Amino acid sequence: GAMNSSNYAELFNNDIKLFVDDTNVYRVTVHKTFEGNVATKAINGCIFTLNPKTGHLFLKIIHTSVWAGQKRLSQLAKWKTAEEVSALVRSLPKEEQPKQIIVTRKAMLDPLEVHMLDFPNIAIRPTELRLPFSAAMSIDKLSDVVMKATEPQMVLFNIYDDWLDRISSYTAFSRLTLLLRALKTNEESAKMILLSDPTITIKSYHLWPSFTDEQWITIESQMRDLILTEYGRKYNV
Amino acid sequence: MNTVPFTSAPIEVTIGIDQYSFNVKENQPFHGIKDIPIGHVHVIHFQHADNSSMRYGYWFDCRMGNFYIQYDPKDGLYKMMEERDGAKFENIVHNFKERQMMVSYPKIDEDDTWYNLTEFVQMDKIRKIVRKDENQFSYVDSSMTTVQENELSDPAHSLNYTVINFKSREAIRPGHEMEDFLDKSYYLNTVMLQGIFKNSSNYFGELQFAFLNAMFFGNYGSSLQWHAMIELICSSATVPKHMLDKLDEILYYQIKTLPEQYSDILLNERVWNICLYSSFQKNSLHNTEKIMENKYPELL
Numbered sequence A: 001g002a003m004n005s006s007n008y009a010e011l012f013n014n015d016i017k018l019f020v021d022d023t024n025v026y027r028v029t030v031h032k033t034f035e036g037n038v039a040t041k042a043i044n045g046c047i048f049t050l051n052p053k054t055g056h057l058f059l060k061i062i063h064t065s066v067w068a069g070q071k072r073l074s075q076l077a078k079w080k081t082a083e084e085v086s087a088l089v090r091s092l093p094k095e096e097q098p099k100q101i102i103v104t105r106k107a108m109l110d111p112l113e114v115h116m117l118d119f120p121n122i123a124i125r126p127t128e129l130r131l132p133f134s135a136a137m138s139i140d141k142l143s144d145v146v147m148k149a150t151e152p153q154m155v156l157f158n159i160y161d162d163w164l165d166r167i168s169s170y171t172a173f174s175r176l177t178l179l180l181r182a183l184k185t186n187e188e189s190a191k192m193i194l195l196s197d198p199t200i201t202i203k204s205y206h207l208w209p210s211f212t213d214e215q216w217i218t219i220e221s222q223m224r225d226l227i228l229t230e231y232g233r234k235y236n237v
Numbered sequence B: 001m002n003t004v005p006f007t008s009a010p011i012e013v014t015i016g017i018d019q020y021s022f023n024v025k026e027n028q029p030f031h032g033i034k035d036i037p038i039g040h041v042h043v044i045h046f047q048h049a050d051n052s053s054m055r056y057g058y059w060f061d062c063r064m065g066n067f068y069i070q071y072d073p074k075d076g077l078y079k080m081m082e083e084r085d086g087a088k089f090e091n092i093v094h095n096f097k098e099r100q101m102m103v104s105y106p107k108i109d110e111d112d113t114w115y116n117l118t119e120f121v122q123m124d125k126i127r128k129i130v131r132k133d134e135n136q137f138s139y140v141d142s143s144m145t146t147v148q149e150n151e152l153s154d155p156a157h158s159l160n161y162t163v164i165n166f167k168s169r170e171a172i173r174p175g176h177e178m179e180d181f182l183d184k185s186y187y188l189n190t191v192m193l194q195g196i197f198k199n200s201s202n203y204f205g206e207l208q209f210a211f212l213n214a215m216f217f218g219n220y221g222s223s224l225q226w227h228a229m230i231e232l233i234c235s236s237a238t239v240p241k242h243m244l245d246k247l248d249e250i251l252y253y254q255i256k257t258l259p260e261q262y263s264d265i266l267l268n269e270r271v272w273n274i275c276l277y278s279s280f281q282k283n284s285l286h287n288t289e290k291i292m293e294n295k296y297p298e299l300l
Ligand SMILES: COc1ccc(Cn2cncn2)c(Cl)c1
Pocket: B005, B006, B007, B008, B068, B069, B070, B083, B088, B089, B092
């Protein structure tokens, strides 16, 4: 059934699973035409497929060419997501294939179930959690590879950097969701927090800066405040 | 005109024959039903006064044999049986008629309800859905489960309806996932019509038989088959034009005949609203949509 607050910790057991988020697959800018009508221009997108135990991120870049000549693009985008997740699973050796796939939006269940009929043993699950994976395009290096892509492309990342050498996957996921929740609620503030100290750099093979344990605590606290703050600014509390 | 002679009526029972129902009191001198139209299948069904649980009944065709009902006090039900000695049969029926101990199937110049409900239903197909090859008639009841229901427990007592699953490999071609799931024409026309049913009449026959089992016996799995066969047509963008027109007539009479007070359990809100108002065929069922809106506007 559904992944929620009660069974949260199943994400960190030893059964391979993936989260799939499709919120950045189909992306458009809305503009005015010369005649004063409105039209969309698509820009490159990405499927966010994450193993929460290992941090392994399979970033499938959705190039705008996949939309050419197609209709009902918001609906196509869910089936294209499912088509690409299915292809990923097929490409993996049997012992690396997920035992469960958790979609962050219920509208993905039928497209993915259908594309995964060949895998009756892989459970397709929704979730009641409001996870901040839409903010993945606020991570500079991920947005950069998406926007620079001239063809379909799969890029592999560890979204936890090296954190698992020092903390558990539960704690790494909590850190990531806090970072992404902050970037979603106020990207400018959030990014200011992360990069204000020029002496803390991002390694070439990392996504986030090389904070010490003590500096992550400060960072993490500053991200909480931001989220609480914006909650007041937003609600007047 | 054909006859179904009853040895007796030892227990109080509501007896139904197609869309008709009537009450027979315990040990009332009742010896059957006369004037049954030849040329159609029929169903004779039963609900005991003392245990309205288990509606049960027999599908039959009088052209295939001489059939009668006799109560079995060990198994506790009205059983259909076949009498092969045609002479001994005619005699017993004639005696019963002369003493006027039979009720009569009604006939009117203005009625085609039963024909319209059973138009494509054929005893030979019923006997493949309900397996019991030693008899020429077929027993159904409230509790019997379908093969599909069994998959998701005794197989000999199952309703062998055609499995219809929209999220199955049978329904979905590799490489046409979105196409085949959103437009089910391939599954309707190639898999089911050309492949399994062979023609639309056999398809409509199973659809009509599932409806009738749902209505007369409150057979849950039958209702599921009925809704699934409707939905497969309604969710298909390409349907032979003759099939759409015939479906509209089929469903019109089903809706017309449904008891007003049973609409709450035999009509799937999701399927009907989808079929009438969202599906490819939302504008192709004019008669059915007009009777649904005037009779059951609440469901919609
Ligand atoms: C009520 O109709 C019927 C018809 C045939 C039989 C069977 N039988 C008749 N005479 C000898 N055997 C019975 Cl018992 C009842």
